[PDB]
Amino acid sequence: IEKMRESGDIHSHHGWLHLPDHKAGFSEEQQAIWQKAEPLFGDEPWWVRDLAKETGTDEQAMRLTLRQAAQQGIITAIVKDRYYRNDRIVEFANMIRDLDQECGSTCAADFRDRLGVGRKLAIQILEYFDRIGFTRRRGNDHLLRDALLFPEK
RNA sequence: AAGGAGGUUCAUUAAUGUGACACGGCCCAUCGGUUGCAGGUCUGCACC
């Protein structure tokens, strides 16, 4: 198998060995749900079990098809079973943006005193960004070793 | 001194039960839940 890898007959990424031709594109069978799922997802994203209830599709089927949708880059789970759009992820970064500059610490209080975004939401946002590397957590505060949150000045 | 310790009434014969084994004793987390409302992380009040 290694011999073929080195020849270049099989190109693999993240330890998954797929033919170089594969694009992880998907099938229509998924898209047909994703069309009705699109406006829904847009105006406010919601949880898996609720999604399945809204489109009359099996919970496990629905979660897996949306995980593939998320592999495509359409929706992001901030926490397991909770999926959002992209345009609100960048907005989550807009609210984290004012913390290092206005406070110099990261705390919960500003969830209610800045936009109105709930504590549960903000904390799951933070753990999503901690796994990503946008922020890191140590004792009382979050560090910024590797992100683009930083403005030029 | 309702008294005081004597006697009359109570026992023919009647052996044996193959092997192993139960009952079950310990903290008492003092229901849970991909649910709400708060706080930088413990649970307190609603839901149920």
Q: DSSP characters for chain A?
A: -HHHHHHTSSEEETTEEE-TT------HHHHHHHHHHHHHHHHS---HHHHHHHHT--HHHHHHHHHHHHHTTS-EEEETTEEE-STTHHHHHHHHHHHHHHTSS--STHHHHHT---HHHHHHHHHHHHHHTSSEEETTEEE-SS-S-----
Residues lining strand B at under 7 Å (Cβ) are A 47-49, 80-81, 106-109, 111-112, 118-120, 122-123, 126, 137, 140, 142
**A137 DSSP β-pair partners:** A142
Q: Which method was it determined by?
A: cryo-EM
CA A98/CA A114 separation, integer angstroms: 9
R_g (Cα) of chain A, nearest Å: 19
Q: What angle, rounded to 10 degrees, do the helices at A48-55 and A59-71 form?
A: 110
Residue at token pair 């140590």: A138
Residue at token pair 């489109």: A55
User: Which nucleotide C1' is nearest A79 CA?
Assistant: B34
User: Which nucleotide C1' is nearest A140 CA?
Assistant: B40
Bases along strand B below 7 A from a protein CB: 34, 36-41
Query: What's this structure's resolution in Å?
Result: 3.4
Neighbours of A143 (CB within 10 A): 13
Task: Of A72, A88, A68, give the one whose Cα is nearest residue A128.
Answer: A88
CA A104/CA A2 separation, integer angstroms: 50
